[PDB]
Amino acid sequence: TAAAIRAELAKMEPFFPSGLKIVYPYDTTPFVKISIHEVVKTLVEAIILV
Amino acid sequence: TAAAIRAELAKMEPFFPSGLKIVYPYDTTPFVKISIHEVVKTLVEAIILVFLVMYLFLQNFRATLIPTIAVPVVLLGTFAVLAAFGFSINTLTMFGMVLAIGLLVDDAIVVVENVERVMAEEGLPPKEATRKSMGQIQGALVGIAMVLSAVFVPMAFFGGSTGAIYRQFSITIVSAMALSVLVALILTPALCATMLKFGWFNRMFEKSTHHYTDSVGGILRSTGRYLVLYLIIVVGMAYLFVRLPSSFLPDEDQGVFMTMVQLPAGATQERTQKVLNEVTHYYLTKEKNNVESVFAVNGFGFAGRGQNTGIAFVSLKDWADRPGEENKVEAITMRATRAFSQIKDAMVFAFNLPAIVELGTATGFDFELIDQAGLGHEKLTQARNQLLAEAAKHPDMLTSVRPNGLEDTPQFKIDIDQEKAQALGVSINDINTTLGAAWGGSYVNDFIDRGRVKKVYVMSEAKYRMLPDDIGDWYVRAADGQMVPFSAFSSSRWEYGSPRLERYNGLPSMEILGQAAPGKSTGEAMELMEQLASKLPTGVGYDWTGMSYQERLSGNQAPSLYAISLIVVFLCLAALYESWSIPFSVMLVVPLGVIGALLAATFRGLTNDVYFQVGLLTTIGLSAKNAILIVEFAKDLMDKEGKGLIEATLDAVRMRLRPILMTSLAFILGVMPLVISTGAGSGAQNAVGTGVMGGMVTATVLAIFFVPVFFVVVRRRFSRK
Amino acid sequence: MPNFFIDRPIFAWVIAIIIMLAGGLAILKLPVAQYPTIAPPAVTISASYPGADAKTVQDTVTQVIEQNMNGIDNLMYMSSNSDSTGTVQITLTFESGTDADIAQVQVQNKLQLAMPLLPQEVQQQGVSVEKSSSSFLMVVGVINTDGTMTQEDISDYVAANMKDAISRTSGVGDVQLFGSQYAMRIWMNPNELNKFQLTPV
Amino acid sequence: EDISDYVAANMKDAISRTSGVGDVQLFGSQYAMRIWMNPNELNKFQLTPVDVITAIKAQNAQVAAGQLGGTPPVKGQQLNASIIAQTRLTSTEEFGKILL
Amino acid sequence: ADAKTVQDTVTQVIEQNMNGIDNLMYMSSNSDSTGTVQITLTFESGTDADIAQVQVQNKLQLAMPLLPQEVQQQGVSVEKSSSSFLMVVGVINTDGTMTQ
Amino acid sequence: MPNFFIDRPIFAWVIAIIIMLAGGLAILKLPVAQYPTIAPPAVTISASYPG
C-alpha cells in the first residue's frame, strides 16, 4: 500500500503549484524493510555456520 | 437467470389484456445454450470414429468395446472432478475435453495395442499377455502422465483477464489425464483380460512395416542430410511463428447484434426516430433473409439517456438457415454499416460484440484526459482539442482517435434579477418554481392507479414550452396580487454549455477512445499518445482505464513460463530414463508437431488464438509421449536384452507404428468436424480443428521416421571420443 | 497394481461405473454458465434530478457523492459522467475477485452519508446502487396484436405488472424499461393560470 | 491555510481511494467560504445573521430549470436545449456584494 | 392509520423497491388497521442471512425518502424472522403498586 | 525409500531439483511484510451531532 501511496503521490507532483514539497515524516515502512534484511541475512549466515 | 425470467413471465401470461404477446428480441442465452452443446456433439460423435479406427486395426467387437469404453469413463469422471473443483461446464472446459480425447484413446490403445502383440509371442494366453504387457508398460504410463503435466500446467499460472481462461484447459486436462491412468491400472488391464482374444487387406501394414523398419536406421548414413533436415524444419518454425499474428479469442456469430445510432447532441426526438426507422427498415427489406427481428429503441443512451441516441437490437435466424460467411454477423454487419454512413446524416453503425470479452480484446485504448488543476471545462475541451489535433498528424501509424459525445451545445441562460422581483413584491421561490415547473417537470406526490401506487407531475403542456419566446407566457402573482411577468425581473442570452460532464476519479475528465488499427502495435499507440499528452497546457494530466488499464497490467510472459516447462519436461524425462542425456531423444520432437500447426493456421485464415495453444500443447505433448514409448523400448530392448547399436532402435521403432498410426489416425479422424464446421460456434471449433489435425499428420509420419535418428544422434554422440 | 483387478474384475467394472455416475450426477448440477467469469465487479450509484442540467446535476450531487467515496477495498477507478437530461450515473470498477456483495455494500455505506445532502428532488426521485454487467443479458418484447392498446398503454401494463418481479428476481442485476409506467399528468396552461390569477405554485 | 486547501481538495481524495489505503484523517481543513459577522455593524443596519443566512441562501444557490423543446415535444419541434437558470457563487466578490 | 392509509402510504412503495436483493424465494406483507406493517421476505435454502438482511435493509434505505414523515420518525426496522425462542422471563408485581 | 534412489539417483536428484525449482519461485511473487495479520479486527461507529 505504501508503494501505491507513493505511486499516486508521484502522479500529483507534476501539477503542484509553484514550489511545494512532499516531506515524508513519520513512516514505519523502512523498519519492516530492514527487520527482514536482518533475519534473511542471519539465515544465509545461519546456513554458513552449520 | 434466464430460466427464471422466462418462467417468471410464464406466471404472468395467463392474465394480461387481450392481445398482448411477449415477443423475444435480442437474447444471448440460447447461443451459449446451443454452442456448448454443439461441442457435446463432437465428443459424443468422436467417440464413434475412434471406435471405428480401433477396428480397421484390431478387427474384433469385444476387443474394441474395451478401448472405446475408456474415454467415456474418463470423461464422465472429469465432469465430477470439475464439479469437485468448484468449476463449470462451458466452452473452455469442453474443448479441453475434446483436445483431451487424444490423451485417452491413446493411453487405451497403447495398453491393449500392446497386449495385442505378445499375443504374437505366447501362442494363446490372455491374462499372461495383458499382465506381462503390464509392468513392462505400467511404470511407463505413470511417467508420461507425470510429464505431460507441465506441457499443460505451466499455463494457467500467469493469471490476468486471461489466465483464468487457460486455467480451465489446464485443469480439465491435467485431470481427466490422471483418470486415464487410473482407468489404465484398473479398467483397461483386466476387462482386456476378460473379453480380449483380406490377403490384400491385413497385409497392407505388415508388408509396409518392414519397408518402414528398413528406411529407418539406413537413414543419415552415406548422406547425413537428415540431422540437417531438422535444423531446417526447425528454423522452419520460428519463421511462420513470427509471421502468424496472435489473438485472444475468435469473435463469433451468436446470432444477434446491436446497432448504435447516436445523432449529434441536440437533435430532436422526432429526428432520432427517423434515423432509427430505416435502420429498422434497411434490415427489414434487404438482409431480410437474415434479420428475423428488430427491436428499435429511441431515447436509449448506452452511456446515459438522451433524446439524441438510440439503439437497435437486431436478431438473426437459426444460422443453419444462413450458410457461408456472407450470412455471418461479421459480413451482415459489414455491409450493414457501409449502407449506413451513407444516406444517414448521423454516426449510425452496427457491430458484433466480442464473445467472452468483457474487456479482454476490445482493440485500442481508453485515454481519459483529466483536468489536474483548477482549469475548468473550456480549457479542457481545448487541451483535448490539441491532443486530438496531433493524433491526426501521426496517422503514419494506424490510429482513429476521438472523444465521446460531450460536444458542447447551445444553452439558453435566463438570469433572474433578485432586486426587480422583490422590488415588484415577487418572491424568488414563487419564480423558481414556476420556471421549473412548467419547463422542468415537478412531481408533487402520489395518486393511485387501479391499486398500484403511481407518481403525479405538474408541468407545461408541450405547446407552451418550445422556444424562448414562450417564457413570455408565465406571469407570477406578487404580494399585491398584480400578475407580474418574467420580463420584468429577468433577461436571457443564448450561450454554450455542456450536455455531459465526465469526471474520472474525482477530477473533471474527458474520454478519448482510439485504436492502432491494422499495422502497428497497441503499445506504440499508447506510447505515442502519452508522448503528445505531455505538451498540452499546464495542468492537464491523463490516464488509462479499461482495456488499457489491463494492457500495462496482465501480460505474465509465456516463454518466461514455458521455459520453466522445459526445465520440468527435462528433469522429469531424465528422472524417468535415469539419464542426463537420453531425454533429448524426446524433447526434440517438440518442433515436428508445431511445424504442422504454425502451418494450416497459416494455410487457413487463422491466428494464435487460445484453442491454438491447446491444440499446440495437446500435440507438443502427445507427440512427446509416443516418442517416449519409442525411446523407452530402446535403453530396454538394449539395456535389458541381447541387443544394442541399431538392434535397440530395431523392434523399438518397429513396434511403435501400429500404435502411433492408430492413435494418430484415432485422434485426427475424430477432430474431423471441428476443421470445416457448419456455422454455430464454428469460430471456436474451426480453430481448435485446423491447429490440431494439421499438426497431427505433421508429427505423426514426420516424427515416426524421425525420433529414431534423435535417439542415436543423442547417446551415440555422448559416447564419441 | 493392475494384477488385482486383472484376476478379480467386476471390481473394476464398478469403479468405472461409480466413477461414471459420479459425472452423471456432477452433470445434472454442474453450472453451464456461458464462459468463466473474467469481468471485474462494477457497482453504479445513479441519482436523478428532474430537468436539472449537467453542470447543475453534477455540481450539486455527483461531486457531493464522489467526495464521499473512500475506504473501499479493491477499487480500480470510478468514473462519474452525467448527462444534462437531468441524470447521473457513477460507476465504480472494483478489483477482480472482489466480493461483489460486499462492494455493493461498502459503496452504500459511504453513499448513505451523502443522502442528507442531496436536493430533496434527487431523493424523492429515488437514488440507486447496483451490481451487474453493463451489456444486456436479454430483451423482452411486449407487443399488442389486436392493437387494442397503445405504446403508452403498454409501458404502463408492463411497469405496473411485470417489471416489479423482474427487477426483483435473483440474478436480475438490473432491469431497464423500454418506455415508462403512467402518472397523473397535469399538462398546465399559462394563458389560463394567467386569466384566473394562478401560478403553478 | 493555503496549502492545507491544496492537499485537501487536490490530493486527499485519490490518496484515500488509493490501494491498501484504509481511512485517511487530514491535518488541516479544506477551504470554506468563511463569512465573518460584525456585531455592532450588523446592528448598525437593523439586521441579524438570520437575515444574513436568509440572503446567502437565495443569493448563492443552483436551480433546475427544465428545457426548451421539453421532454415530450409538440409535433414539429426543431430547437432543443437546456435552460440554465439561477446559479452558484464561485468567487468571493459576489459573496461580498450579496444584497442584504 | 388503517390498511389503505397504510397499504398505499407505506407497504407498497417500500415493496416497489425490493428489487436488487439476491436469492429471494418469495415475499409477503401485512397492512392492518393499527398502523402496523410487517413485510417478511423468506429467501432460498442456505443463503447467508447476515448478508440477505443487509441488502433487503440496505435497499429500504432508498425508499425512506418516499415514506411519509410520520413513519420515518417511528422508523422502519429490519430484522431476522424468529417470533418464539429460548426463554421468556416475566416481571410481575404482586401488590398493585406498579402498572403495566 | 532407499535401495531405490540409492540405486537410481538421477530420479532422486531430479526430485530435489523440482522442489527447489518449484518453490523458490514462490519467493519471487509471494507477499512480504513484518507480521502477518496479527491484531484482531475491529469496527467503529461514528456519530457526531453539533455542540
CATH number at residue C93: 3.30.70.1430
Residue whose C-alpha is closest to residue E54's, from E84, E87, E83, E21: E21
Scored b (16 or more CB within 10 A) or e, B295-312 reads bbbbbbbebbbbbbbbbb
DSSP assignment letter at B180: H
Phi, psi dihedrals of residue C65, rounded to the nearest 5°? -65, -50
E18 vs E24: CA distance, rounded Å? 10
- Evaluate whether chains B and C are touching (3 or more beta carbon pairs less than 8 Å apart): yes
B225 vs B219: CA distance, rounded Å? 9
Q: Which amino acid is residue B269, in one-letter code?
A: Q
A11 vs B698: CA distance, rounded Å? 53
C-alpha cell belonging to residue B378: 473550456
Contact between B516 and B547 (Cβ < 8 Å): no
CA distances from B441 to A27, B433, B438, D71 (A): 55, 10, 6, 9
Contact between E59 and E84 (Cβ < 8 Å): no
Residue whose C-alpha is closest to residue B70's, from B224, B219, B177: B177
F7 vs F11: CA distance, rounded Å? 10
- Evaluate whether chains A and F are touching (3 or more beta carbon pairs less than 8 Å apart): yes
Name the helix (H) or strand (E) containing B414: strand B409-414
Scored b (16 or more CB within 10 A) or e, B183-214 reads bbbbbbbbbbbbebbeeeeeeeeeeeeeebbe
Chain F: partners with 3+ C-beta pairs within 8 Å? A, B
DSSP assignment letter at E66: G
Q: Inform me whether the C-beta atom of residue A8 falls under 8 Å from chain D C-beta atoms.
A: yes
C-alpha cell belonging to residue B3: 430460466
Q: Inform me whether the C-beta atom of residue B563 falls under 8 Å from chain F C-beta atoms.
A: no
Best of A32, A35, A37 to substitute, by most chain F Cβ atoms within 10 angstroms, is A32
Q: Inform me whether the C-beta atom of residue E16 falls under 8 Å from chain B C-beta atoms.
A: yes
> F35 to chain A: nearest residue by CA?
A32
For residue B505, the chain C residues in CB contact (below 8 A) are 77-79
Contact between B510 and B369 (Cβ < 8 Å): yes
D90 vs B589: CA distance, rounded Å? 74
C109 vs C104: CA distance, rounded Å? 9
Contact between D19 and A6 (Cβ < 8 Å): no
Spell out where C50-201 has E strands: 75-79, 82-83, 87-88, 91-94, 141-144, 184-188
CB neighbours of residue C35 within 10 Å: 20
In three-state form (DSSP H/G/I as H, E/B as E, the rest C), the secondary structure along B101-150 is HHHHHHHHHHHHHHHHCCCCCCCCCHHHHHHHHCCCCHHHHHHHHHHHCC
Give start and end residues of each alpha helix (H) in C29-116: 55-57, 63-67, 100-114
Contact between E52 and E23 (Cβ < 8 Å): yes
Contact between B189 and C6 (Cβ < 8 Å): yes
Phi, psi dihedrals of residue B336, rounded to the nearest 5°? -40, -40
CA distances from C154 to B17, B550, C144 (A): 10, 43, 8
Residue whose C-alpha is closest to residue B460's, from C189, D82, D77: C189
Q: Which amino acid is residue B181, in one-letter code?
A: V
Q: Mark which residues 4-23 of A lie under 8 Å from F by CB.
A: none
Contact between D29 and D1 (Cβ < 8 Å): yes
Q: Inform me whether the C-beta atom of residue B561 falls under 8 Å from chain F C-beta atoms.
A: no
B557 vs F45: CA distance, rounded Å? 46
Sort strands D81-82 and D67-68 into parallel, antiparallel or unpaired.
antiparallel
Q: Inform me whether the C-beta atom of residue B181 falls under 8 Å from chain C C-beta atoms.
A: no
Please say whether the dihedral angle defined by the alpha carbons of residues B388, B393, B394 and B400, taken in this order, is positive or negative.
positive
Q: Mark which residues 29-48 of A lie under 8 Å from D by CB.
A: none
By three-state DSSP, how is residue B508 classified? Answer: strand
Contact between C64 and C114 (Cβ < 8 Å): yes
Residue whose C-alpha is closest to residue B400's, from B514, B530, B528: B514
For residue C175, the chain E residues in CB contact (below 8 A) are 19
Angle at F34 between CA F29 and CA F39, to 5 degrees: 115
The residues with which B293 forms a beta bridge, in sequence order, are B315
The CA distance from D89 to the nearest CA of chain C, in Å, is 12
The CA distance from B422 to the nearest CA of chain C, in Å, is 17
Spell out where chain F has E strands: none
CB neighbours of residue B362 within 10 Å: 17
D8 vs C63: CA distance, rounded Å? 14
Sort strands B475-477 and B483-485 into parallel, antiparallel or unpaired.
antiparallel
The CA distance from B151 to the nearest CA of chain F, in Å, is 15
Strand order in the sheet with B511-514: B402-403, B511-514, B365-368, B543-544
Domain B254-358, architecture per CATH: 2-Layer Sandwich (3.30)
How remote is the C-alpha of B333 from its chain's centroid? Answer: 20
C-alpha cell belonging to residue C148: 387494442
B268 vs B407: CA distance, rounded Å? 16
Domain B409-497, architecture per CATH: 2-Layer Sandwich (3.30)
- Is the fold of B200-253+550-721 the same as that of B254-358? no
Classified by CATH at the fold level, domain B359-408+506-549 comes out as Alpha-Beta Plaits (3.30.70)
Angle at C44 between CA C41 and CA C50, to 5 degrees: 170
C-alpha cell belonging to residue B515: 485504436
CA distances from B271 to B347, D80, E87 (A): 13, 12, 71
Sort strands B452-460 and C184-188 into parallel, antiparallel or unpaired.
parallel
Q: What is the resolution of this structure in A?
A: 3.1
> D16 to chain A: nearest residue by CA?
A5
Residue whose C-alpha is closest to residue B366's, from B520, B543, B552: B543
Angle at F32 between CA F27 and CA F33, to 5 degrees: 155
Q: Please tell me which of the candidates C59, C74, C78 has its beta carbon nearest to residue D88.
A: C59
Phi, psi dihedrals of residue B444, rounded to the nearest 5°? -55, -60
Best of C108, C162, C175 to substitute, by most chain E Cβ atoms within 10 angstroms, is C108
Q: Which residues contact C120 (CB under 8 A, 6 or more apart)?
A: none
> B576 to chain F: nearest residue by CA?
F11
Kindly determine whether residue D14 and residue A17, on different chains, have CB atoms separated by under 8 Å: no
CB neighbours of residue C131 within 10 Å: 21
CA distances from B516 to B251, B394, B401, E79 (A): 19, 11, 9, 55
Helix B590-597 to helix B682-704 angle (10° resolution) is 140
The CA distance from E82 to the nearest CA of chain C, in Å, is 23
By three-state DSSP, how is residue E97 classified? Answer: coil
The residues with which C78 forms a beta bridge, in sequence order, are C92
Kindly determine whether residue E13 and residue B453, on different chains, have CB atoms separated by under 8 Å: yes
Please say whether the dihedral angle defined by the alpha carbons of residues C113, C114, C118 and C123, taken in this order, is positive or negative.
negative
Contact between C61 and C118 (Cβ < 8 Å): yes
The residues with which C141 forms a beta bridge, in sequence order, are B23
C-alpha cell belonging to residue B648: 535397440
For residue D19, the chain A residues in CB contact (below 8 A) are 1, 4
Phi, psi dihedrals of residue D2, rounded to the nearest 5°? -140, -45
Q: Please tell me which of the candidates D17, D58, D73 has its beta carbon nearest to residue B269.
A: D73
B202 vs D66: CA distance, rounded Å? 89
B437 vs B125: CA distance, rounded Å? 99
CB neighbours of residue E62 within 10 Å: 19
Kindly determine whether residue C59 and residue D83, on different chains, have CB atoms separated by under 8 Å: no
B124 vs B411: CA distance, rounded Å? 98
C-alpha cell belonging to residue D78: 426543431
Phi, psi dihedrals of residue D18, rounded to the nearest 5°? -60, 160
The residues with which D81 forms a beta bridge, in sequence order, are D68
For residue A11, the chain B residues in CB contact (below 8 A) are 541
CA-derived radius of gyration, chain F: 25
- Evaluate whether chains C and F are touching (3 or more beta carbon pairs less than 8 Å apart): no
Q: Please tell me which of the candidates E19, E58, E63 has its beta carbon nearest to residue C108.
A: E58
> F36 to chain A: nearest residue by CA?
A32
By three-state DSSP, how is residue F41 classified? Answer: coil
Contact between B525 and B516 (Cβ < 8 Å): yes
CB neighbours of residue B610 within 10 Å: 27
Q: What's the full length of chain B, in residues?
A: 721
C-alpha cell belonging to residue B14: 395467463
C-alpha cell belonging to residue F8: 537410481
C42 vs C94: CA distance, rounded Å? 6
Name the helix (H) or strand (E) containing B659: helix B658-667
Spell out where B316-399 has E strands: 349-351, 365-368
Phi, psi dihedrals of residue B503, rounded to the nearest 5°? -145, 155
Residue whose C-alpha is closest to residue B373's, from A14, D90, D31, C60: A14
Residue whose C-alpha is closest to residue B71's, from B111, B108, B112, B39: B108
Phi, psi dihedrals of residue B630, rounded to the nearest 5°? -100, 50
C-alpha cell belonging to residue B351: 457491430
Place of cell 522429469: B572
Contact between B714 and B655 (Cβ < 8 Å): no
Rounded to 10 degrees, what is the CA torsion of C183, C184, C186, C187?
Answer: 50
Kindly determine whether residue E20 and residue C128, on different chains, have CB atoms separated by under 8 Å: yes
Contact between B97 and B176 (Cβ < 8 Å): yes
Domain holding C121, by residue range, is 38-132
The CA distance from C148 to the nearest CA of chain E, in Å, is 28
Place of cell 402520489: B446
Place of cell 411486449: C142
Q: Which amino acid is residue B350, in one-letter code?
A: A
B311: region left, alpha or beta (phi > 0 left; psi from -120 to 50 alpha): beta
Contact between C33 and C86 (Cβ < 8 Å): no
Superfamily the domain B200-253+550-721 falls into: Multidrug efflux transporter AcrB transmembrane domain (1.20.1640.10)
Contact between B500 and C54 (Cβ < 8 Å): yes
Chain C positions contacting chain E at CB under 8 Å are 101, 104-105, 108, 112, 115, 123-124, 126-130, 164, 167-170, 172, 175
Q: Inform me whether the C-beta atom of residue C83 falls under 8 Å from chain D C-beta atoms.
A: no
Kindly determine whether residue C128 and residue E62, on different chains, have CB atoms separated by under 8 Å: yes
B391 vs B525: CA distance, rounded Å? 10
B384 vs D34: CA distance, rounded Å? 35
Kindly determine whether residue B165 and residue C162, on different chains, have CB atoms separated by under 8 Å: no
Helix B138-148 to helix B166-186 angle (10° resolution) is 170
Contact between B45 and B166 (Cβ < 8 Å): no
For residue D3, the chain A residues in CB contact (below 8 A) are 20
Phi, psi dihedrals of residue B398, rounded to the nearest 5°? -70, 120
Q: Please tell me which of the candidates A8, A16, A20 has its beta carbon nearest to residue D18.
A: A8
Residue whose C-alpha is closest to residue B451's, from E18, E71, E31: E31
C-alpha cell belonging to residue A45: 549466515
B333 vs F32: CA distance, rounded Å? 51
Sort strands B442-449 and C75-79 into parallel, antiparallel or unpaired.
unpaired
For residue C67, the chain D residues in CB contact (below 8 A) are 13
Name the helix (H) or strand (E) containing B337: helix B329-339
Kindly determine whether residue C66 and residue D13, on different chains, have CB atoms separated by under 8 Å: yes
Q: Which amino acid is residue C80, in one-letter code?
A: S
B217 vs B222: CA distance, rounded Å? 11
Q: What's the full length of chain C, in residues?
A: 201
Contact between B55 and B109 (Cβ < 8 Å): no
> C81 to chain B: nearest residue by CA?
B502
B554 vs B163: CA distance, rounded Å? 9
Q: What's the full length of chain E, in residues?
A: 100
Helix B707-715 to helix B645-655 angle (10° resolution) is 150
DSSP assignment letter at C40: P
Q: Inform me whether the C-beta atom of residue E5 falls under 8 Å from chain B C-beta atoms.
A: no
CB neighbours of residue E2 within 10 Å: 11
Chain B positions contacting chain A at CB under 8 Å are 372-373, 538-539, 541
CA distances from B230 to B227, B559, B589, B591 (A): 6, 22, 10, 9
Q: Please tell me which of the candidates B20, B130, B449 has its beta carbon nearest to residue C6.
A: B130
The CA distance from C17 to the nearest CA of chain E, in Å, is 32
Q: Inform me whether the C-beta atom of residue B537 falls under 8 Å from chain C C-beta atoms.
A: no
Contact between B236 and B321 (Cβ < 8 Å): no
Give start and end residues of each alpha helix (H) in E7-83: 12-14, 49-60, 69-74
Give start and end residues of each alpha helix (H) in chain E: 3-6, 12-14, 49-60, 69-74
Residue whose C-alpha is closest to residue B329's, from B570, B682, B642: B682
Kindly determine whether residue A4 and residue D20, on different chains, have CB atoms separated by under 8 Å: yes
The residues with which C194 forms a beta bridge, in sequence order, are none
Contact between B490 and B412 (Cβ < 8 Å): no
C-alpha cell belonging to residue F23: 518453490
Widest Cα–Cα separation across chain A:
59
Kindly determine whether residue B193 and residue C36, on different chains, have CB atoms separated by under 8 Å: no
End-to-end alpha carbon distance in chain F: 78
C-alpha cell belonging to residue B712: 542415436
C112 vs E64: CA distance, rounded Å? 12
Contact between B322 and B289 (Cβ < 8 Å): yes
> C159 to chain E: nearest residue by CA?
E16
Name the helix (H) or strand (E) containing B570: helix B559-577
> B371 to chain A: nearest residue by CA?
A15
